[PDB]
From a paper:
A distinctive feature of [name] is the presence of Lys19 within the lining of the substrate‐binding site. We probed the importance of this residue by mutating it to L‐Ala, L‐Glu, and L‐Gln. Crystals of [name]([name]) were isomorphous with those of [name](K19Q) and were obtained only in the absence of L‐Asp. The kinetic data, even when reduced to approximate turnover numbers, demonstrate that Lys19 plays an important role during catalysis and its mutation reduces the rate of catalysis by two or more orders of magnitude.
L‐Asparaginases (ASNases) catalyze the hydrolysis of L‐Asn to L‐Asp and ammonia. In contrast, the chain of ASNase from [name], reported here and referred to as [name], consists of only 172 amino acid residues. [name] is homologous to the N‐terminal domain of typical bacterial class 1 ASNases and exhibits millimolar affinity for L‐Asn. Crystal structures of the wild‐type [name], both with and without bound L‐Asp, as well as structures of several [name] mutants, reveal topologically unique tetramers.
Numbering used by the authors:
A (entry chain A), D (entry chain A): 1 to 171
B (entry chain B), C (entry chain B): 4 to 168
Amino acid sequence: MAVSPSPLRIFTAGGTIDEDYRLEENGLVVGDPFVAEVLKTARLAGAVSIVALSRKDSLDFTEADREAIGRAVGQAVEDHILLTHGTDTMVETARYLGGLPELAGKTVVLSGAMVPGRVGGSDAAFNIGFACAAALMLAPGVYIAMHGKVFDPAKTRKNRGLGRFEPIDDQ
Amino acid sequence: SPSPLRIFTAGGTIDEDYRLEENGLVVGDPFVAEVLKTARLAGAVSIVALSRKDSLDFTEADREAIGRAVGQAVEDHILLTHGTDTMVETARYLGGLPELAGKTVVLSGAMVPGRVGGSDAAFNIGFACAAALMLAPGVYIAMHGKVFDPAKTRKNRGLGRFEPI
Amino acid sequence: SPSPLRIFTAGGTIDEDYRLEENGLVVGDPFVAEVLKTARLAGAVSIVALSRKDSLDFTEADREAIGRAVGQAVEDHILLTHGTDTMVETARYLGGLPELAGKTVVLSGAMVPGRVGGSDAAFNIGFACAAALMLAPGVYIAMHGKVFDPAKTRKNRGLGRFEPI
Amino acid sequence: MAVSPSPLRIFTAGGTIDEDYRLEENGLVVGDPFVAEVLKTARLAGAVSIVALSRKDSLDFTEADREAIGRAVGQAVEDHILLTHGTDTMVETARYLGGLPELAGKTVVLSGAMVPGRVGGSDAAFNIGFACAAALMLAPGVYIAMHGKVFDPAKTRKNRGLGRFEPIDDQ
Ligand SMILES: [Cl-]
Ligand SMILES: [Cl-]
């Protein structure tokens, strides 16, 4: 009888995508992983394991946290990986992962959202669909998937003011 | 940049909305435009309306007109949003057209209207836009977080899903 | 505190939801419970399910059973969520029952299902809960941000609204 | 031919109810008035004039701002008034308005939301429905309408930690 394969694993490191309002803080905190909400209603043929690695706010996120993400991605059986993450340091994590030889036969995609998923008008659900497809279809490597396109982490910056990733032009 | 994408809308469950005059759902404005409005896209996209007919009412003549319309696009990356009832019929017909052989054509839609809570539509649109950009030339169905070969796929009406034959 | 409120659910557009098996809307779980879950209430509320029938299918016998059910409540403040097609018929029938004469009974619902985008349901529920707490004993329809006298009201099916006669 | 009366006027002073995410701030700001969004889809028989008075964040809100709200409410022709406002100083504004003899024949209700309207799971739409009804049905006075009940501002406090208004018990 046919067994539907589950080629994709998702890891979550928090970020804007997962932010939610809490009364105590009178403001946003990093909440539960929004990617789980999106996949719950995606009516998937397979299944996707979603493993939560970290929810630190961006200021507290360290090298040691980035090392733990590399160990988790490297230890996964799956060769197709989506990491949801904050956009302010996504490029630094992507560049770090691109240097691990352990990742050489894996397609690893980083994504997230400029607007929290739990806020009206969020990019999150589109971005998760696009990034899931990217993780399945791209050749091995490390990529950022945002704005409905694929970015090379070595040639990308975050424009903090505009909430967009932009290519670094070759000179 | 990504390659320019052309999106055609042929109606279906994805676009259904409630109307007081009908006391129920009717095919309304294309939901894909609502999703892409907030997707903060970098690439070139253009959305064109083909139809708001029920996909069950499509004739062979209708499918021939959808094929000619996809062939009017310069773009080589195409998304067609469509009802799931006859998505396999339209997809198999397009896959037979030599005039489309250099294009990546992806059909998608939703099992639950985009304007109803808990819909698959926004995820499906993201997934299918990536698929239209990234897959080799051909015709495909992108639903349920996977890519289907139309020749080897059927719509299970009772289970609300696509399945391998 | 406010006086305890009892809420009865009799179905209707407010509670409609999409089902793949029907390829369309059916009366689902009461939407009023979804609204009150996030309303952070201070007062006593209890929600009881009466029916998920189409309001057009209500008989005189059904309206008599709704009257007896409202009379089983100790509470003197009652909200009944209901379809708009026969809301005036149920409301006029309840207004004729001496056994309800000390109760404030408010009927409400929605023109657009709560689970569809752009629905009036959550505003209607807030408004009707206030109305059930604050109005003098009687039977009322609370819709469109106002209070209607059932005896002097009709459902315009074509315009999707209630109106004075 | 029948003219539908419009007995209710709404004023907006910002608060949590109106908060929205902005990329530049990387967080919530006081946005456009959420009550307008709720009434847009309420299918009203009448109309409601919605007048925006202030969007200051809570720290910048002063006595002079509170005085301007009292002048706007007193000058309105309508005798049924809903003021949407922050919950942290709603009691102080309500007590201030309760002391204006100019308001004596008006029903004035203050409301808002513990969770921004543009965040998932908000109380805002319910609260606006309830508070509109309260403004129409209550006898003249100044009230807070939250948690599906009516509070007397002289006998109410905000519990900041729990996001709730509570009665001050008579001793
Ligand atoms: Cl914030
Ligand atoms: Cl329907």
